[PDB]
Design a protein around this ligand. Structure first.
Ligand SMILES: [Mg+2]
Lengths: 97, 114, 123, 93, 223, 98, 57, 223
RNA sequence: AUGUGUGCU
């Protein structure tokens, strides 16, 4: 936040709205300054987030952060079947191959 | 439902409709408050069209969960724009607007059973 | 001859070539109809190593009746796609559903988008 | 959902009756030329690339949207077995 | 490539517009800004404030006139008017009637270049000895403004009325998925528009497009 | 850090000294006892399962290492720690139906 | 596979419906028919509602 | 009441643009749509395919090189090769050296109208007698183009690379207020744009404006 | 083609 506060920006209108709703939610304390409200939110792991596809702020603070995620040994291409007509067996006419 | 703010009566006080209302604008009792019988939001914001109340919410003046006054199919109703929005959803879905309002229930929230 | 453009060695396909479903990997016949080895409907990729165990084998097993085996190491790099299985250390398994482009993704007030989106209803 | 199925399920005694009806209709509609249709002038199923569903993309679609109108009649015994088959290949290509 | 625009328009209020095929992501990118403009920008008209003869408070009841003051105030918001010339910025409509009649939006006396786009809206049923003399204010605002924000005290004890300028009743868009032989992830914009009768959905849309263009031309002169 | 070393994933140093030749195929080590012992770095060895086992060098030519200090990384190691995945910026919230 | 082929492939299905089966199928609603939609990716995409039907997560 | 436009472009990489004032909420109605096109569209320039001296497939090593083939290639995606004229569609850069030296990207052989804005980039450290001789083909496309798609075979053993076409790296808008002492509810747009150098933020913003404009024109002739 | 074993559901 200090980066922004210095850079020549501040509490966005959207952030203001989100804070206003967060008050009625009961995460922030009523009475402090927008910066302090955002501080309280940032303490609980939560933070303002924008929709992205609209620019309308997600009315309600949500928790963001970097967690650890692996990719599991299974994939999709390992398990993929889509044959209509193909090989059968001489021993049994049920299709496989 | 928030803090009472200041005072909790309009069960019958004839003065409370014109006076207590101003109170919220002063600082007394907030909007969706159990100020008895109704709340300022039911006095202050009376939306004519059922649709118009929803147009209002797009302008951040009343949330979809604040209790206000609307008018569906011709009669005064005490509810949130969100609930009336649900009602209209259930309507436009099946096109028959009559049974739409009748089959649902607009007095409680919606859950599994509902 | 187009199918043999990869076949470098006398019988063996080249190393570093691209093989695809249906591509000819090894060439050989029996009683003269083609009974070669081709790449199955799954996928090939890029060949990285080719081992051959001839008859003049400096001390190997080799199965009965067989004269020489031809094994191929076809490698391929696969990226995270819709359908792969993702999980953490805390134990939340879950497939990938959609790969929303950078634009229409939840982003902070700072120009930083979010990488992964987890449903709270799983907690 | 499908083209007004509640009208259909009710149009018959058993729900399976409808399936067999729709089916056999589609069959004889495909086998004896796609011309023995009973609603081909304006009220007819159509597609999206061109409007070429007027010819022969789906056989079932046509049956379902056909029975919607009182143009045909089902039943147990209506026409002698062989005669039907013969005259159904006569009257059409 | 190039996207086709397809109209299915019902009368003068509702219209369904579908513009496709679109590039991946351009669906919402185009559909969202317009909806914000349509619900807030379009020039329209509304009843700003009202003065009745024996009504002091907004929550009153006047005998002889069946309907409570507030319900009448709602119907006042339900009408829609149109100005012929740009000159008319603020006009006062004027009404007067008594007896076993009923007031409709047509009974208001025509003031110069003012057109009532909607007449048979029911204002108020009156009983015997039911006396009703009231006046209305009309501005050319842009969108919705709560009554408790302006409250144009035209007369002394006039009543603030929530101004419903926004000609459109509501606007909703959806981005479905269309394919182009090769790819299937091609966005498909389908936007539906609901207006009051002052202006067709098509008009609202054209207005929106223009409003966005004029804004895209501001990023031309640096300083 | 203990996992990677006890599991014989990566290769560590056997005795104190400096770096000789950080190759993508080898790392030669300056033992103070006049000995440079040869280490293979093995790029693509097919695992029993289907994955791949790679060792990639982590020190640069001309640097002093210590006995028991890493020289390369195992198939699941980043600078000597167990690296079984990624650190992605995740936001936990409902999103459409996705 | 060029554009021609794909478009024709949409012309072959239309109202055609496919059967989708679950892992342990148990009750009647264990297999549901749907109309195919040619989507990209590689995995099968299924509607949310019928998950509880044949118990699919 | 006419929108003032302001610029603060610190260098070639960073960019900042300000619009003030806008009426109601029109800050976001402009901020996001630009952000979408800035991150989706806009012509970028990246490495498409690379051919190494002796290396055949992507999964090899090179004597005298700390980084294996894949890790080296990986560094080439984070390389910004800025052109000058639209004619340059396929500039095939070249590079070769030996001896113990961190091959910085500033070692490439310079070309007519081509300048690499990314000089400090680490390609590979060379060992005692480590030699590399490669052809790094550079194309001009748009968006994320997976290497698995195009498969541009420059030589015969040339290995395709993920095509990362997007000169803009990050975008963030803020909406403040003030100006015009009449209506207090006003918008103040501030669009911040971060690019890799190949296109300065100004040029990018302009191109995006053009994209949005052109797309807005599509609502013209119905059916 | 059967058995052993592991993995996922
Ligand atoms: Mg499961």
């Amino acid at each position: 936040f200090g980066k922004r506060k210095g850079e020549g920006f501040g509490v966005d209108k959207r952030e203001v709205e989100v804070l206003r709703r967060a008050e009625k939610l009961g995460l922030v304390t009523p009475g402090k300054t927008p910066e302090e409200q955002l501080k309280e939110l940032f303490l609980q792991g939560k933070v303002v987030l924008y929709d992205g596809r609209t620019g309308e702020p997600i009315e309600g603070p949500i928790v963001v952060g970097q967690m650890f995620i692996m990719k599991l040994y299974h994939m999709v291409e390992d398990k993929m079947h889509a044959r209509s007509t193909g090989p059968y067996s001489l021993i049994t006419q049920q299709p496989l191959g | 439902k928030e803090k009472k703010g200041a005072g909790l009566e309009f069960a019958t006080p004839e003065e409370a409709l014109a006076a207590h209302e101003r109170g919220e604008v002063a600082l007394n009792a907030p909007i969706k408050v159990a100020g008895r019988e109704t709340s300022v939001g039911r006095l202050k914001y009376v939306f004519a069209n059922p649709d118009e109340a929803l147009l209002a919410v797009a302008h951040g003046i009343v949330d979809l969960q604040d209790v206000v006054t609307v008018r569906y199919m011709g009669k005064r109703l005490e509810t949130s724009p969100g609930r009336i929005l649900f009602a209209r959803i259930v309507a436009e879905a099946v096109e028959d607007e009559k049974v739409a309002w009748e089959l649902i229930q607009l007095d409680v929230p919606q859950e599994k059973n509902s | 001859e187009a199918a043999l453009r990869d076949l470098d060695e006398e019988g063996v396909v080249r190393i570093g070539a691209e093989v695809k479903p249906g591509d000819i990997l090894v060439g050989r016949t029996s009683f003269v109809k083609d009974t070669s080895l081709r790449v199955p409907p799954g996928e090939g990729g890029i060949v990285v190593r080719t081992v051959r165990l001839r008859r003049g084998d400096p001390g190997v097993e080799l199965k009965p009746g067989v004269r020489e085996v031809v094994r191929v190491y076809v490698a391929q790099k696969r990226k995270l796609q819709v359908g792969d299985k993702l999980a953490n250390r805390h134990g939340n398994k879950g497939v990938v559903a959609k790969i929303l482009p950078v634009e229409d993704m939840p982003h902070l007030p700072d120009g930083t988008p979010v990488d992964v989106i987890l449903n709270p209803l799983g907690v | 959902a499908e083209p007004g199925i509640d009208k259909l399920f009710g149009m018959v005694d058993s729900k399976y009756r409808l399936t067999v009806v729709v089916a056999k209709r589609a069959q004889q509609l495909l086998r004896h030329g796609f011309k023995n249709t009973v609603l081909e002038p304006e009220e007819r199923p159509k597609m999206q690339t061109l409007e070429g569903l007027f010819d022969d993309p789906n056989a079932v679609t046509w049956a379902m949207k056909e029975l919607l109108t009182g143009r045909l009649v089902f039943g147990e015994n209506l026409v002698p077995e062989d005669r039907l088959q013969k005259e159904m290949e006569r009257l059409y290509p | 490539k190039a996207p086709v625009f397809t109209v299915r328009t019902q009368g003068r209020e509702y219209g369904e517009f579908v513009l496709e095929p679109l590039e991946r992501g351009f669906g919402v990118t185009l559909g969202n800004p317009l909806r914000r403009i349509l619900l807030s920008s379009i020039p329209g008209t509304a009843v700003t404030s009202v003065y009745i003869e024996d009504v002091l408070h907004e929550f009153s009841t006047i005998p002889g006139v069946k309907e409570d003051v507030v319900e009448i105030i709602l119907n006042l918001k339900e009408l829609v008017v149109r100005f012929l010339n740009p000159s008319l910025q603020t006009v006062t409509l004027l009404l007067k009637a008594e007896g076993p009649k009923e007031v409709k939006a047509r009974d208001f006396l025509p003031v110069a270049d003012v057109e009532i786009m909607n007449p048979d809206l029911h204002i108020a049923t009156l009983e015997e000895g039911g006396r009703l003399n009231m006046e209305v204010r009309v501005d050319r605002g842009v969108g919705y403004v709560p009554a408790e924000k302006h409250g144009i005290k035209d007369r002394i004890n006039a009543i603030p009325v929530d101004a419903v300028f926004s000609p459109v009743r509501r606007v909703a868009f959806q981005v479905e998925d269309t394919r182009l032989g090769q790819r299937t992830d091609l966005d498909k914009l389908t936007l539906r528009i609901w207006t009051d009768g002052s202006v067709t959905p098509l008009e609202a849309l054209n207005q929106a497009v223009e409003i966005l263009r004029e804004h895209l031309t501001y990023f031309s002169n640096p300083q | 850090e203990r996992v990677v070393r006890d599991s014989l994933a990566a290769l560590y140093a056997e005795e104190d000294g400096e770096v000789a030749k950080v190759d993508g195929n080898r790392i030669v080590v300056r033992y103070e006892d006049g000995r440079l012992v040869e280490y293979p770095l093995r790029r693509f060895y097919r695992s029993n399962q289907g994955t791949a086992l790679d060792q990639r060098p982590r020190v640069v030519v001309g640097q002093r290492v210590r006995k028991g200090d890493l020289l390369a990384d195992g198939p699941a190691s980043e600078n000597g720690f167990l690296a079984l995945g990624q650190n992605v910026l995740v936001a936990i919230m409902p999103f459409d139906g996705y | 596979i060029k554009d021609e082929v794909w478009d024709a492939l949409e012309e072959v299905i239309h109202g055609k419906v496919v059967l989708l089966n679950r892992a342990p199928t148990l009750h009647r609603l264990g297999i549901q028919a749907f109309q195919p939609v040619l989507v990209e990716g590689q995995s099968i995409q299924l509607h949310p509602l019928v998950c509880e039907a044949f118990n699919a997560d």
